[PDB]
């Protein structure tokens, strides 16, 4: 770790936009990691700050970085429902078929909270509808467990294509 890198992780988690910029302007490692392996891009997407996520991606943040649990910034944004951040990561080449230690893709996490608009966007970027997690649950199996018939009809139409 670095004293500038450790400060950048705290600045990104704290939602301090000007601190994040002035830190990597002083030479902070944009791909720094904590003990969990999370980058500032993880924390910026977790707290839901699109302006901080985009500036990290411009300075060279690893969009496909995954922490020790296997969760990427695309995983976290799909969970919390930050569509604008989900769209921003994909434009910078985010892996839509990345799986964590549960075998869950961003399609799994978004469908578990009923984020309908994010599920469609992920499918448009080539999301595997037939991907199963460690429990053998596909993105359709989750929709039946929660019971979102609106979401359940969307994925069946996608698997038939």
């Amino acid at each position: 770790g670095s004293d500038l890198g450790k400060k950048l992780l705290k600045a990104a988690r704290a939602g301090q936009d000007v601190e994040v910029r002035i830190l990597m302007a002083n030479g902070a490692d944009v791909n720094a990691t904590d003990i969990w392996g999370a980058t500032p891009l993880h924390l910026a997407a977790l707290i839901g700050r699109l302006e901080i996520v985009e500036v990290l991606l411009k300075n060279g943040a690893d969009v496909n970085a995954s922490d020790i649990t296997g969760t990427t910034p695309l995983h976290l944004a799909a969970t919390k429902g930050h569509l604008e951040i989900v769209e921003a990561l994909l434009k910078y080449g985010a892996d839509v078929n990345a799986s964590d230690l549960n075998g869950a893709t961003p399609l799994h996490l978004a469908a578990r909270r009923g984020h309908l608009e994010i599920v469609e966007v992920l499918l448009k970027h080539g999301a595997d509808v037939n991907a199963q997690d460690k429990f053998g649950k596909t993105a359709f199996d989750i929709s039946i467990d929660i019971g979102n018939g609106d979401l359940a009809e969307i994925l069946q139409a996608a698997a038939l294509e």
Partner: protein, 217 residues
């Protein structure tokens, strides 16, 4: 604590799937989540990790409790030494296998669910034709200067909710100008922490107090 059960159920109705945290008297924090847990998994199957602004990452003891029917509620009660406010607090629920379950970043001052105010009294005003309400903040709760209140004016059984008055920060009294005479009114007050310095939801209603107005001159 029976009231703690009703506080957890109220937050559970707002968002059942996600991890829920709240503070009562700003010197505590309880994070819980209700899941459809099988008969095999227990509190040792997960790991509740947290980190303050500069403190190292620490583990929180997890307790298992049954809620409703067929569901299990796991909850962590942070030590009082690690209940600082106005600073980022990171949270991670991770199964002992290493699988990710939850990941949150919260501020304790933004999830305050106080207790109901106490000591509500109702008198007539020094001036003619008004009713003065006075109450006390929730007992043993700091920073009463930033607590907002709302009083409820009720009527006879079968109806009520005649008026709703919001009281500004710190002030714990209220004057009522347009009240009918020779009628039984019933009052009640609830408290919440004020924005933008704080955040949360309304607390429970205080124990009510009734009053019968005199004749209108």
């Amino acid at each position: 604590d029976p009231k703690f059960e009703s506080k957890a159920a109220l937050l559970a109705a707002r968002g059942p799937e996600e991890l829920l945290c709240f503070t009562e008297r700003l010197e505590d924090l309880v994070c819980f989540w209700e899941e459809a847990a099988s008969a095999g998994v227990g509190p040792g199957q997960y790991s509740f990790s947290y980190q303050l602004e500069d403190e190292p990452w620490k583990l929180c003891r997890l307790h298992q409790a049954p809620t409703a029917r067929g569901a299990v509620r796991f909850w962590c009660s942070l030590p009082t030494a690690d209940t600082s406010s106005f600073v980022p607090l990171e949270l991670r629920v991770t199964a002992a296998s290493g699988a990710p379950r939850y990941h949150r970043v919260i501020h304790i001052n933004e999830v305050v669910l106080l207790d109901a105010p106490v000591g509500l009294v109702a008198r007539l005003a020094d001036e003619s034709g008004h009713v003065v309400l006075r109450w006390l903040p929730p007992p043993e709760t700091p920073m009463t200067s930033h607590i907002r209140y709302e009083v409820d004016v009720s009527a006879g059984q079968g109806a009520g909710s005649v008026q709703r008055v919001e009281i500004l920060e710190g002030r714990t009294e209220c004057v009522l100008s347009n009240l009918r005479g020779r009628t039984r009114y019933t009052f009640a007050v609830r408290a919440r922490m004020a924005e933008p310095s704080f955040g949360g939801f309304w607390s429970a209603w205080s124990e009510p107090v009734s009053l019968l107005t005199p004749s209108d001159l």
